[PDB]
mmCIF file of C-alpha atoms and ligand atoms in Angstrom:
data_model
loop_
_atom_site.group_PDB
_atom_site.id
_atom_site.type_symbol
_atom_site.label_atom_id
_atom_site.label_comp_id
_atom_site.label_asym_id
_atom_site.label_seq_id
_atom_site.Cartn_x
_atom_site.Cartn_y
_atom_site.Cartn_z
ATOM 1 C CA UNK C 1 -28.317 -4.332 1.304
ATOM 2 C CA UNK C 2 -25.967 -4.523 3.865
ATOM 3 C CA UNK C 3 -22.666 -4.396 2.435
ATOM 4 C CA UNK C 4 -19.289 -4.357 4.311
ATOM 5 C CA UNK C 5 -16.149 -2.251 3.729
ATOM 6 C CA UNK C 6 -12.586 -3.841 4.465
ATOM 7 C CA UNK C 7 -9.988 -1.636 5.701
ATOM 8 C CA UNK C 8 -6.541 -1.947 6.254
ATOM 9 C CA UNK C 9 -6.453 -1.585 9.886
ATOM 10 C CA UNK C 10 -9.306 -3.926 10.196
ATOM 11 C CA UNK C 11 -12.038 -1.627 10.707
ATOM 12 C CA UNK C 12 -15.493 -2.680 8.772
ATOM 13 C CA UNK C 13 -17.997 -0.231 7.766
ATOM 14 C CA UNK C 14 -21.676 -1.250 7.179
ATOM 15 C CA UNK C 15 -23.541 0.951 4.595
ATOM 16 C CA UNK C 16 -27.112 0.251 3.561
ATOM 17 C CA UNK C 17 -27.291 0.139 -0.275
ATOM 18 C CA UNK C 18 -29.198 -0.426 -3.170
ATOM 19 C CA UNK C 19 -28.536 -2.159 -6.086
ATOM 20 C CA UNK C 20 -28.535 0.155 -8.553
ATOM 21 C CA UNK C 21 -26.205 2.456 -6.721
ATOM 22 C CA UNK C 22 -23.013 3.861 -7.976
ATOM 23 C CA UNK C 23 -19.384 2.905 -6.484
ATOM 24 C CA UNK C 24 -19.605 6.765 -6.550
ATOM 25 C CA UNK C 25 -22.420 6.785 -4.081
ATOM 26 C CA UNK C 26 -21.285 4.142 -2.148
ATOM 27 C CA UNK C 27 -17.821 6.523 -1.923
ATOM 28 C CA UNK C 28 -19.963 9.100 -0.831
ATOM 29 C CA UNK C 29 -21.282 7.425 1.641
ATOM 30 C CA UNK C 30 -17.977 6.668 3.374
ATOM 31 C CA UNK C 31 -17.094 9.919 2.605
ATOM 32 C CA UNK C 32 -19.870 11.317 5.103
ATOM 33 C CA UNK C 33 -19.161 8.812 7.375
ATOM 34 C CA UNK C 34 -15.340 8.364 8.029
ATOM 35 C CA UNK C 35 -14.353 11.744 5.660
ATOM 36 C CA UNK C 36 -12.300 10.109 3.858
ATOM 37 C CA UNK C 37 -12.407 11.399 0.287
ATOM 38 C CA UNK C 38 -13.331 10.039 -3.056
ATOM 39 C CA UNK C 39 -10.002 11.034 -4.449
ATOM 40 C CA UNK C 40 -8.330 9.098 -1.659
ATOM 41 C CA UNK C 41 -9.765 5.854 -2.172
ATOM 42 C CA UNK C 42 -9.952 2.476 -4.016
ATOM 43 C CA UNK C 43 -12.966 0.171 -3.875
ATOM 44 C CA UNK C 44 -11.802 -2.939 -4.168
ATOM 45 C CA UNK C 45 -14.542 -6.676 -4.718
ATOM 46 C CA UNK C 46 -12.629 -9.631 -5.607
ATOM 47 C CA UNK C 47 -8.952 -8.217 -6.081
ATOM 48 C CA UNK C 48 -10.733 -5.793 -8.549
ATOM 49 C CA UNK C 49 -10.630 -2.036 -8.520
ATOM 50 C CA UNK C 50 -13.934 -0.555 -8.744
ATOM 51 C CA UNK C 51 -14.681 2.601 -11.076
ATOM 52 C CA UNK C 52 -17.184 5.510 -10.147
ATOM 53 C CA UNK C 53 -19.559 5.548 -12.925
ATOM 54 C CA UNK C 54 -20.772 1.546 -12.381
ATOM 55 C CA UNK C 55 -23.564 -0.284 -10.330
ATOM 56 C CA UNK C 56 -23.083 -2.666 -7.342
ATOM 57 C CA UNK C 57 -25.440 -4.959 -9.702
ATOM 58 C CA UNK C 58 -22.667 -4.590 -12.695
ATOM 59 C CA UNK C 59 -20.158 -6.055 -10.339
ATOM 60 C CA UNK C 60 -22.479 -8.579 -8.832
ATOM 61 C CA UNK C 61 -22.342 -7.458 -5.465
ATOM 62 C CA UNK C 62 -25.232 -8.832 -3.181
ATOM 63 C CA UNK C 63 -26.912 -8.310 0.236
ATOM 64 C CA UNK C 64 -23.317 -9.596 2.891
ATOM 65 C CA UNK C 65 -20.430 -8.596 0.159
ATOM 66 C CA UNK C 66 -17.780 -7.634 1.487
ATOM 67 C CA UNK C 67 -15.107 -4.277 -0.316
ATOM 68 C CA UNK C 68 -11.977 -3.416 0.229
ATOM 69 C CA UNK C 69 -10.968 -0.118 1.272
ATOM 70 C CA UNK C 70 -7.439 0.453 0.085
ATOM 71 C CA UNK C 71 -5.546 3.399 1.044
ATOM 72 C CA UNK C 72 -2.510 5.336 -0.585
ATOM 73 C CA UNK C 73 0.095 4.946 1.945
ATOM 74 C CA UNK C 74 2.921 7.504 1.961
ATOM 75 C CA UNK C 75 5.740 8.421 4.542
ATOM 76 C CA UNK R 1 6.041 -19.934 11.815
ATOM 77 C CA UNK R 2 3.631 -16.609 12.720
ATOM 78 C CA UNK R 3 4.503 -14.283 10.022
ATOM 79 C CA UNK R 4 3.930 -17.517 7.822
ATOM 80 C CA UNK R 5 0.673 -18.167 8.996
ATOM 81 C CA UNK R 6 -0.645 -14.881 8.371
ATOM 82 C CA UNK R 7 -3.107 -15.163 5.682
ATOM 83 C CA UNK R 8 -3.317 -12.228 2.856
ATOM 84 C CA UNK R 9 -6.298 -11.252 1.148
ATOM 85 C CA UNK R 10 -5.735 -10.147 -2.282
ATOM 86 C CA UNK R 11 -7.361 -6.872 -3.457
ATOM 87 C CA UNK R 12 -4.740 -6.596 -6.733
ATOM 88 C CA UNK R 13 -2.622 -8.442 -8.863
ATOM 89 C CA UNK R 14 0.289 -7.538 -7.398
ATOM 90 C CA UNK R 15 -0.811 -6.234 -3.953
ATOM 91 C CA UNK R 16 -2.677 -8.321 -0.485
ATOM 92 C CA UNK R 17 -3.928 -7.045 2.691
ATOM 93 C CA UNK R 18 -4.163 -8.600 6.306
ATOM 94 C CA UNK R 19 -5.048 -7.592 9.761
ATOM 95 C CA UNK R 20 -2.376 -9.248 12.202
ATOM 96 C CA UNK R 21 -1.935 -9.167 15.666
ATOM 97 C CA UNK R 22 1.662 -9.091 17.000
ATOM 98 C CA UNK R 23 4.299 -6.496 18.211
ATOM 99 C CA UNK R 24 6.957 -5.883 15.191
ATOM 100 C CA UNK R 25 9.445 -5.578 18.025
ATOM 101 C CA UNK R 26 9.302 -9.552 18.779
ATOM 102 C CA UNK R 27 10.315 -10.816 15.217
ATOM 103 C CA UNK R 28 12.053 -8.075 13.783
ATOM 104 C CA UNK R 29 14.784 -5.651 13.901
ATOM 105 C CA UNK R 30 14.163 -1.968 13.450
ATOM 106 C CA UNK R 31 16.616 0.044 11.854
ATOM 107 C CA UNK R 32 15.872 3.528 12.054
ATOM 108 C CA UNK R 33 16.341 5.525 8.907
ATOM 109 C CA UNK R 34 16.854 9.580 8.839
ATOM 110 C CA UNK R 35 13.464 11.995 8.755
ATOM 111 C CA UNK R 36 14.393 13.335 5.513
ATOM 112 C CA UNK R 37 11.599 12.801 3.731
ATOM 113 C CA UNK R 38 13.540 9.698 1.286
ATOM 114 C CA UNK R 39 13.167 7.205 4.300
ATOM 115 C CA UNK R 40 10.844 5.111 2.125
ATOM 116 C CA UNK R 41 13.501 4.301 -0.129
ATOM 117 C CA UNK R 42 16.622 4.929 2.345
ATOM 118 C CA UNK R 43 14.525 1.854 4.316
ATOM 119 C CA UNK R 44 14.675 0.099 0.953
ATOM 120 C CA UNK R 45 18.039 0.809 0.354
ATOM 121 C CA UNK R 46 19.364 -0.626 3.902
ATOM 122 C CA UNK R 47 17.900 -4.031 3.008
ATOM 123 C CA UNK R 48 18.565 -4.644 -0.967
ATOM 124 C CA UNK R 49 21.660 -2.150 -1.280
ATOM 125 C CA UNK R 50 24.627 -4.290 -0.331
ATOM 126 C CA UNK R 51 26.881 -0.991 0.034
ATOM 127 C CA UNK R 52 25.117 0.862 3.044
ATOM 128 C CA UNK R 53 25.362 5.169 2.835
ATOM 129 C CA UNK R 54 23.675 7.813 3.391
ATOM 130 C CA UNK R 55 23.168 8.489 -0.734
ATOM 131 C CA UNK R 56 22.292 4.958 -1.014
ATOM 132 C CA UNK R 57 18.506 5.946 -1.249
ATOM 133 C CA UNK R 58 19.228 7.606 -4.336
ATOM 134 C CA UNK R 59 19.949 4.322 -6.178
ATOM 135 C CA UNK R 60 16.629 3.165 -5.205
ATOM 136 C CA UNK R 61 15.061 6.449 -6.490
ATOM 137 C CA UNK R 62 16.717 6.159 -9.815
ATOM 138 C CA UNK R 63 15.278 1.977 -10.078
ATOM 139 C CA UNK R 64 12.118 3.683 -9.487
ATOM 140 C CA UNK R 65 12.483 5.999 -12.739
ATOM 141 C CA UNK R 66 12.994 2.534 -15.071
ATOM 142 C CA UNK R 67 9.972 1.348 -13.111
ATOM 143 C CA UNK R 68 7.333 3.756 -13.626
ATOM 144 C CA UNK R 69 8.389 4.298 -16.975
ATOM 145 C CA UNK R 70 7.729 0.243 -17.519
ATOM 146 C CA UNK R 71 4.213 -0.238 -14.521
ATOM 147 C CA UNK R 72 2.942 3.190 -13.881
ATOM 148 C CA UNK R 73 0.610 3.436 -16.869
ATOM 149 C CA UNK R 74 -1.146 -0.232 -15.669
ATOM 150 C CA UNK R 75 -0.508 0.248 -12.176
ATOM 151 C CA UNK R 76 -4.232 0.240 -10.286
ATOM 152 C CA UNK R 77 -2.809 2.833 -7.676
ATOM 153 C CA UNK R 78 -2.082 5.243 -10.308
ATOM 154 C CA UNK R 79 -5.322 5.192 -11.976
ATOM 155 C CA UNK R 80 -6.402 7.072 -9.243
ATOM 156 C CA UNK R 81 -4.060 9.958 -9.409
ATOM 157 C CA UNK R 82 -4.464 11.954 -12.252
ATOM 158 C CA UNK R 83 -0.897 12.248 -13.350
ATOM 159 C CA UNK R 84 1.196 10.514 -16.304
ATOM 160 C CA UNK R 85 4.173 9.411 -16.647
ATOM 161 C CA UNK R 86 6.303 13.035 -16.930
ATOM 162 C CA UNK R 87 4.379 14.554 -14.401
ATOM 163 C CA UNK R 88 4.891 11.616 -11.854
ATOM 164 C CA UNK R 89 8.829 11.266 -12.330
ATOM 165 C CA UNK R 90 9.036 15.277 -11.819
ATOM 166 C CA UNK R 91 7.290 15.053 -8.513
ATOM 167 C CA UNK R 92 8.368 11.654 -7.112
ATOM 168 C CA UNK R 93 11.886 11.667 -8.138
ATOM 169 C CA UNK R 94 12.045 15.059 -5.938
ATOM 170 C CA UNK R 95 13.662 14.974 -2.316
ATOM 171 C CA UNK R 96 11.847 15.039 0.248
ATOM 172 C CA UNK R 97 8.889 13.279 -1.737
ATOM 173 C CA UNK R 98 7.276 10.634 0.128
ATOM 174 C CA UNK R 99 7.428 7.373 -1.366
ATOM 175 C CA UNK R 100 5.208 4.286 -0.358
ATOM 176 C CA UNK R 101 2.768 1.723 -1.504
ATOM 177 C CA UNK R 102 2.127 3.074 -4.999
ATOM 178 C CA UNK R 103 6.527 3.289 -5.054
ATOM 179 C CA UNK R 104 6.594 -0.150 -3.619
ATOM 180 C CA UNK R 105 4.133 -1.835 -5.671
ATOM 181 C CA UNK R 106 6.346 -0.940 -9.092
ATOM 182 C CA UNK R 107 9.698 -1.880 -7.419
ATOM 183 C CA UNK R 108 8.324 -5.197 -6.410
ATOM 184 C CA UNK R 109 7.830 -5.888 -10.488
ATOM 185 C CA UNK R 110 10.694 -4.339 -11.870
ATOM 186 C CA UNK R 111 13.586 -5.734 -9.202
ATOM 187 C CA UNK R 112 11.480 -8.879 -8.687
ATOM 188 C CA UNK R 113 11.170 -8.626 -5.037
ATOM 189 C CA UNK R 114 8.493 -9.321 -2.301
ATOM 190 C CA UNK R 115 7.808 -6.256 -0.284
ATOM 191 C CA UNK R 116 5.467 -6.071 2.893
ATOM 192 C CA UNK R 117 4.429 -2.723 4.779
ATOM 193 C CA UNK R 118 3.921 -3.625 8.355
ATOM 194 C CA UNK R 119 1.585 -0.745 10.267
ATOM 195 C CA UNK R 120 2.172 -0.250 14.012
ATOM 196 C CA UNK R 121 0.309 2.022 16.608
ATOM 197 C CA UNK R 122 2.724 4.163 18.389
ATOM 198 C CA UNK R 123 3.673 0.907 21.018
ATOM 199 C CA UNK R 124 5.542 -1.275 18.380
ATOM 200 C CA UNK R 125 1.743 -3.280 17.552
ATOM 201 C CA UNK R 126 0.642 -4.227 14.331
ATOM 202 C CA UNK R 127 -2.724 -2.400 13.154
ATOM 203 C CA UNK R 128 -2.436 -4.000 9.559
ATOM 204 C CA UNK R 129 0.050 -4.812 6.378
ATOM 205 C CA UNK R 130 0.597 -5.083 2.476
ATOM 206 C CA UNK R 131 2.301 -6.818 0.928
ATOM 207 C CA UNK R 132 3.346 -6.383 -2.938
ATOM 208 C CA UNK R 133 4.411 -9.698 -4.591
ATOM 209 C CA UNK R 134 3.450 -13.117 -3.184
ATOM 210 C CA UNK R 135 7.151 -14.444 -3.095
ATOM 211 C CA UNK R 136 8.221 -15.604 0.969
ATOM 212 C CA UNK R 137 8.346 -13.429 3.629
ATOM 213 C CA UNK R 138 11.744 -15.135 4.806
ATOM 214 C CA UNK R 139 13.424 -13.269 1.105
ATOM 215 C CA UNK R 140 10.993 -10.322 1.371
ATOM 216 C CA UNK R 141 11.821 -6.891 2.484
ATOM 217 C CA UNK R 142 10.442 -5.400 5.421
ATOM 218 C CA UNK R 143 9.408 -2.190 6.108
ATOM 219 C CA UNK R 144 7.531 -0.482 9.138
ATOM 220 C CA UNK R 145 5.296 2.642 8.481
ATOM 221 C CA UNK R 146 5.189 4.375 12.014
ATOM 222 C CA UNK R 147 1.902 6.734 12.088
ATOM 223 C CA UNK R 148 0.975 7.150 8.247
ATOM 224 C CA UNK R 149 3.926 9.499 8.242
ATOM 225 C CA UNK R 150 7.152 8.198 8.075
ATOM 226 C CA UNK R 151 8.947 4.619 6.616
ATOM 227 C CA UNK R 152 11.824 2.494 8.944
ATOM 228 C CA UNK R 153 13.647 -0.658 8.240
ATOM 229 C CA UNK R 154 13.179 -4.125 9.573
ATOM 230 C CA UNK R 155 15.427 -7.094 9.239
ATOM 231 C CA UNK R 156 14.324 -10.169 10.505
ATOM 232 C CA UNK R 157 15.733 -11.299 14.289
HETATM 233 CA CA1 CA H 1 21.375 4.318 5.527
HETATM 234 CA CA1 CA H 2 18.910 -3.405 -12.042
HETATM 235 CA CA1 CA H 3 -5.418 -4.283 13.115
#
Protein backbone atom coordinates (compact mmCIF):
# COMPACT_ATOMS: atom_id res chain seq x y z
CA UNK A 1 0.00 0.00 0.00
CA UNK A 2 1.08 3.15 -1.03
CA UNK A 3 0.03 5.59 1.39
CA UNK A 4 0.80 9.38 1.40
CA UNK A 5 1.86 11.69 4.26
CA UNK A 6 0.63 15.47 4.24
CA UNK A 7 2.87 17.96 5.62
CA UNK A 8 2.59 21.37 6.42
CA UNK A 9 4.96 22.77 4.03
CA UNK A 10 3.53 20.65 1.35
CA UNK A 11 5.96 17.99 1.19
CA UNK A 12 4.34 14.27 0.62
CA UNK A 13 6.01 11.23 1.73
CA UNK A 14 5.21 7.81 0.12
CA UNK A 15 5.70 4.78 2.49
CA UNK A 16 4.90 1.24 1.42
CA UNK A 17 2.62 -0.36 4.07
CA UNK A 18 0.69 -3.11 5.09
CA UNK A 19 -2.47 -3.34 6.49
CA UNK A 20 -2.01 -4.64 9.58
CA UNK A 21 0.68 -2.18 10.47
CA UNK A 22 0.78 0.04 13.44
CA UNK A 23 0.49 4.06 13.27
CA UNK A 24 3.61 3.23 15.40
CA UNK A 25 5.33 1.60 12.51
CA UNK A 26 4.18 3.78 10.07
CA UNK A 27 5.90 6.66 12.62
CA UNK A 28 8.83 4.71 12.43
CA UNK A 29 9.03 4.71 9.17
CA UNK A 30 9.08 8.50 8.81
CA UNK A 31 11.18 8.51 11.54
CA UNK A 32 14.04 6.71 9.42
CA UNK A 33 13.24 8.61 6.64
CA UNK A 34 12.86 12.41 7.44
CA UNK A 35 14.15 11.88 11.45
CA UNK A 36 11.58 13.33 12.65
CA UNK A 37 10.58 11.67 15.92
CA UNK A 38 7.64 9.77 17.21
CA UNK A 39 7.31 12.12 20.10
CA UNK A 40 7.18 15.01 17.66
CA UNK A 41 4.40 14.01 15.63
CA UNK A 42 0.61 13.67 14.99
CA UNK A 43 -0.87 11.33 12.39
CA UNK A 44 -3.68 12.77 11.32
CA UNK A 45 -6.76 10.64 8.52
CA UNK A 46 -9.86 12.51 8.26
CA UNK A 47 -9.36 15.46 10.87
CA UNK A 48 -8.63 12.52 13.31
CA UNK A 49 -5.57 12.04 15.44
CA UNK A 50 -4.17 8.71 15.13
CA UNK A 51 -2.87 6.65 18.30
CA UNK A 52 0.28 4.27 18.27
CA UNK A 53 -1.05 1.05 19.35
CA UNK A 54 -3.86 0.77 16.22
CA UNK A 55 -3.89 -0.71 12.60
CA UNK A 56 -4.15 1.23 9.28
CA UNK A 57 -7.13 -1.46 8.76
CA UNK A 58 -8.83 -0.12 12.24
CA UNK A 59 -8.92 3.29 10.71
CA UNK A 60 -9.87 2.14 7.27
CA UNK A 61 -7.03 3.37 5.52
CA UNK A 62 -6.54 1.81 1.94
CA UNK A 63 -3.98 1.50 -0.91
CA UNK A 64 -3.86 5.98 -2.12
CA UNK A 65 -4.91 7.42 1.57
CA UNK A 66 -3.64 10.19 2.20
CA UNK A 67 -2.22 11.42 6.46
CA UNK A 68 -1.52 14.35 7.79
CA UNK A 69 1.65 15.15 9.30
CA UNK A 70 1.08 17.83 11.88
CA UNK A 71 3.83 19.46 13.60
CA UNK A 72 4.16 21.31 17.08
CA UNK A 73 5.03 24.71 16.06
CA UNK A 74 6.83 26.89 18.61
CA UNK A 75 8.78 30.30 18.38
CA UNK B 1 -10.08 37.75 -2.73
CA UNK B 2 -6.62 35.38 -2.47
CA UNK B 3 -6.37 34.79 1.14
CA UNK B 4 -10.20 33.94 0.68
CA UNK B 5 -9.73 31.51 -1.83
CA UNK B 6 -7.29 29.56 -0.05
CA UNK B 7 -8.81 26.34 0.76
CA UNK B 8 -8.04 24.62 4.37
CA UNK B 9 -7.93 21.10 4.98
CA UNK B 10 -9.06 20.14 8.31
CA UNK B 11 -6.91 17.70 10.35
CA UNK B 12 -8.84 18.80 13.93
CA UNK B 13 -11.78 20.21 15.27
CA UNK B 14 -10.49 23.28 15.88
CA UNK B 15 -7.34 23.38 13.68
CA UNK B 16 -6.85 23.32 9.25
CA UNK B 17 -3.86 23.19 7.17
CA UNK B 18 -3.02 24.59 3.58
CA UNK B 19 -0.13 24.94 1.29
CA UNK B 20 -0.34 28.56 -0.34
CA UNK B 21 1.68 30.26 -2.63
CA UNK B 22 2.15 34.04 -2.12
CA UNK B 23 4.68 36.50 -0.49
CA UNK B 24 3.17 37.68 3.10
CA UNK B 25 4.80 40.98 2.21
CA UNK B 26 2.02 41.75 -0.63
CA UNK B 27 -1.15 41.52 1.64
CA UNK B 28 0.07 42.13 4.91
CA UNK B 29 1.83 44.29 7.28
CA UNK B 30 4.62 42.98 9.43
CA UNK B 31 5.09 44.30 12.69
CA UNK B 32 8.11 43.15 14.22
CA UNK B 33 7.87 42.08 17.81
CA UNK B 34 11.07 41.89 20.34
CA UNK B 35 13.33 38.39 20.41
CA UNK B 36 12.45 37.79 23.89
CA UNK B 37 11.28 34.65 23.77
CA UNK B 38 7.16 35.98 24.56
CA UNK B 39 6.90 37.17 20.83
CA UNK B 40 4.19 34.55 20.30
CA UNK B 41 1.96 36.25 22.53
CA UNK B 42 3.58 39.93 22.34
CA UNK B 43 2.43 39.25 18.34
CA UNK B 44 -0.94 38.38 19.85
CA UNK B 45 -1.05 41.11 22.02
CA UNK B 46 -0.31 43.89 19.17
CA UNK B 47 -3.44 42.75 17.32
CA UNK B 48 -6.29 41.94 20.12
CA UNK B 49 -4.76 44.25 22.98
CA UNK B 50 -6.25 47.65 22.27
CA UNK B 51 -3.59 49.33 24.76
CA UNK B 52 -0.17 48.58 22.92
CA UNK B 53 3.18 48.05 25.59
CA UNK B 54 5.81 46.31 26.01
CA UNK B 55 4.04 44.18 29.17
CA UNK B 56 1.10 43.82 27.04
CA UNK B 57 2.15 40.13 26.26
CA UNK B 58 1.65 39.36 29.72
CA UNK B 59 -2.15 39.83 29.49
CA UNK B 60 -2.19 37.35 26.81
CA UNK B 61 -0.11 34.92 28.97
CA UNK B 62 -2.43 35.21 31.88
CA UNK B 63 -5.83 34.45 29.14
CA UNK B 64 -3.78 31.53 28.41
CA UNK B 65 -3.81 30.27 32.22
CA UNK B 66 -8.02 30.39 32.16
CA UNK B 67 -7.55 28.56 28.87
CA UNK B 68 -5.62 25.58 29.55
CA UNK B 69 -7.22 25.19 32.70
CA UNK B 70 -10.75 25.01 30.55
CA UNK B 71 -9.06 23.02 26.71
CA UNK B 72 -5.79 21.57 27.67
CA UNK B 73 -7.07 18.27 29.05
CA UNK B 74 -9.18 17.70 25.41
CA UNK B 75 -6.84 19.53 23.40
CA UNK B 76 -5.39 16.85 20.55
CA UNK B 77 -1.92 18.74 20.69
CA UNK B 78 -1.56 18.02 24.24
CA UNK B 79 -2.23 14.44 24.13
CA UNK B 80 0.98 14.20 22.78
CA UNK B 81 2.99 15.83 25.46
CA UNK B 82 3.01 14.07 28.48
CA UNK B 83 2.26 16.86 30.86
CA UNK B 84 -1.06 17.92 32.85
CA UNK B 85 -2.45 20.67 33.67
CA UNK B 86 0.11 21.94 36.76
CA UNK B 87 2.99 20.91 35.02
CA UNK B 88 2.02 22.80 31.72
CA UNK B 89 1.07 26.27 33.43
CA UNK B 90 4.60 26.03 35.40
CA UNK B 91 6.49 25.72 32.19
CA UNK B 92 4.43 27.77 29.69
CA UNK B 93 3.50 30.58 31.84
CA UNK B 94 7.50 31.04 32.22
CA UNK B 95 9.35 33.90 30.19
CA UNK B 96 11.06 33.21 27.65
CA UNK B 97 8.79 30.03 26.92
CA UNK B 98 7.88 29.68 23.44
CA UNK B 99 4.36 29.76 22.74
CA UNK B 100 2.66 28.60 19.39
CA UNK B 101 0.16 26.34 17.81
CA UNK B 102 -0.69 24.22 20.85
CA UNK B 103 -0.99 28.17 22.76
CA UNK B 104 -2.96 29.32 19.81
CA UNK B 105 -5.26 26.56 19.37
CA UNK B 106 -6.72 27.13 23.23
CA UNK B 107 -6.86 30.97 22.82
CA UNK B 108 -8.84 30.62 19.68
CA UNK B 109 -11.69 28.73 22.04
CA UNK B 110 -11.52 30.58 25.06
CA UNK B 111 -11.41 34.44 23.49
CA UNK B 112 -13.45 33.21 20.51
CA UNK B 113 -11.12 34.27 17.88
CA UNK B 114 -9.84 32.98 14.45
CA UNK B 115 -6.12 32.64 14.44
CA UNK B 116 -3.90 31.68 11.31
CA UNK B 117 0.00 30.93 11.41
CA UNK B 118 1.38 31.97 8.11
CA UNK B 119 5.05 30.11 7.42
CA UNK B 120 7.55 31.99 5.22
CA UNK B 121 11.08 30.93 3.88
CA UNK B 122 13.59 33.47 4.75
CA UNK B 123 12.37 35.84 1.39
CA UNK B 124 8.89 36.88 2.82
CA UNK B 125 7.17 33.42 0.78
CA UNK B 126 4.66 31.34 2.14
CA UNK B 127 5.81 27.54 2.68
CA UNK B 128 2.41 26.68 4.50
CA UNK B 129 -0.33 27.87 7.34
CA UNK B 130 -2.85 26.93 10.23
CA UNK B 131 -5.32 28.17 11.05
CA UNK B 132 -7.30 27.58 14.51
CA UNK B 133 -11.05 28.44 14.27
CA UNK B 134 -12.92 28.63 10.94
CA UNK B 135 -14.32 32.25 11.60
CA UNK B 136 -13.03 34.95 8.43
CA UNK B 137 -9.74 35.73 7.78
CA UNK B 138 -10.79 39.55 7.32
CA UNK B 139 -11.58 39.38 11.72
CA UNK B 140 -8.79 36.81 12.22
CA UNK B 141 -5.45 37.45 13.67
CA UNK B 142 -2.41 37.08 11.83
CA UNK B 143 0.70 35.89 12.73
CA UNK B 144 4.02 35.07 10.75
CA UNK B 145 6.40 32.29 12.10
CA UNK B 146 9.85 33.26 10.47
CA UNK B 147 12.14 29.93 10.44
CA UNK B 148 10.36 27.56 13.09
CA UNK B 149 11.97 29.88 15.59
CA UNK B 150 10.49 32.96 16.26
CA UNK B 151 6.56 34.60 16.01
CA UNK B 152 5.89 38.44 14.28
CA UNK B 153 2.74 40.33 13.74
CA UNK B 154 0.74 40.95 10.63
CA UNK B 155 -2.09 43.33 10.10
CA UNK B 156 -3.74 43.29 7.01
CA UNK B 157 -2.63 46.19 4.19
CA1 LIG C 1 4.44 45.57 21.58
CA1 LIG D 1 -11.69 37.86 28.98
CA1 LIG E 1 4.53 25.36 0.58
Amino acid sequence: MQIFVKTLTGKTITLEVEPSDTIENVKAKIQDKEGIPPDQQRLIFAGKQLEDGRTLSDYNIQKESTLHLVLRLRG
Amino acid sequence: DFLEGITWDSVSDIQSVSNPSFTITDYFEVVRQPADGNCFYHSLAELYIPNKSDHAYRLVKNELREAAEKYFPTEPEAAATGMRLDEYLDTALRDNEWGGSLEAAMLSRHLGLTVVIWLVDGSNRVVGATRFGKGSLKTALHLLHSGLTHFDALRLL
